[PDB]
Design a protein around this ligand. Structure first.
Ligand SMILES: Nc1ccn([C@@H]2O[C@H](CO)[C@@H](O)[C@H]2O)c(=O)n1
Length: 193
């Protein structure tokens, strides 16, 4: 059903990418894992870091692909296939250029929206998974995007994103319980200030 049983955080591996905007998904899932005491550990068979544990009475798996962003499907696809997790039971947290820092919205379905992590996943499991879109803002230049997503946000924008992520963590209860509509209402209403 639409109970969430896999939460994927997208990002790039390595200390040099850890604090970049493109790792917003990693930030969310890492903080989720700590909140619920879920151990994230190297999972070489699935080219990622993974964990499993109890979130609010529900058995949930967590996955961070260690493939680099544009190859995220090399982790997500075989992982979800092996555990027989339908896309409708997957939440993928990812950075979103089309929303401001501090804005966070749940979306079901649709395309990759230019996101090359999602672009590597949608072809294989289809579009029908859920996304936690973590706003990272857009750069000045339309050609500045690589420099933006692989760049570190200013303390100001970082605080907004951290606050939004903190809010989302408080609503994961609704997601694993399969009240996706309520989770959408309460997440998507978040104002940073
Ligand atoms: N070694 C690297 C470095 C960066 N990336 C980034 O992931 C983005 C997917 O939107 C790509 O657009 C890119 O910015 C990646 O996949 N692999």
């Amino acid at each position: 059903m639409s109970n969430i049983s896999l939460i994927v955080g997208l990002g790039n591996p390595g200390s040099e990418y850890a604090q970049t905007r493109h790792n917003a998904g990693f930030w969310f899932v890492e903080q989720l894992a700590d909140k619920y005491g879920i151990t994230l550990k190297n999972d070489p068979k699935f080219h990622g870091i993974s964990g499993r544990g109890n979130i609010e009475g529900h058995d949930v798996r967590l996955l961070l692909p260690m493939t680099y962003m544009n190859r995220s499907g090399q982790s997500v696809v075989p992982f979800s296939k092996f555990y027989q997790i339908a896309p409708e039971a997957i939440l993928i947290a990812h950075d979103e250029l089309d929303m401001n820092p501090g804005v966070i919205r749940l979306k079901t379905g649709g395309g990759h929206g230019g996101h090359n992590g999602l672009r590597d996943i949608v072809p294989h499991i289809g579009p029908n998974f859920h996304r936690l879109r973590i706003g990272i803002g857009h750069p000045g230049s339309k050609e500045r995007v690589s420099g933006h997503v692989l760049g570190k946000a200013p303390s100001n924008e970082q605080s907004l994103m951290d606050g939004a992520i903190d809010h989302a963590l408080s609503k994961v209860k609704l997601l694993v319980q399969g009240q996706v509509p309520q989770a959408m209402n309460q997440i998507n209403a978040y104002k940073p200030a």
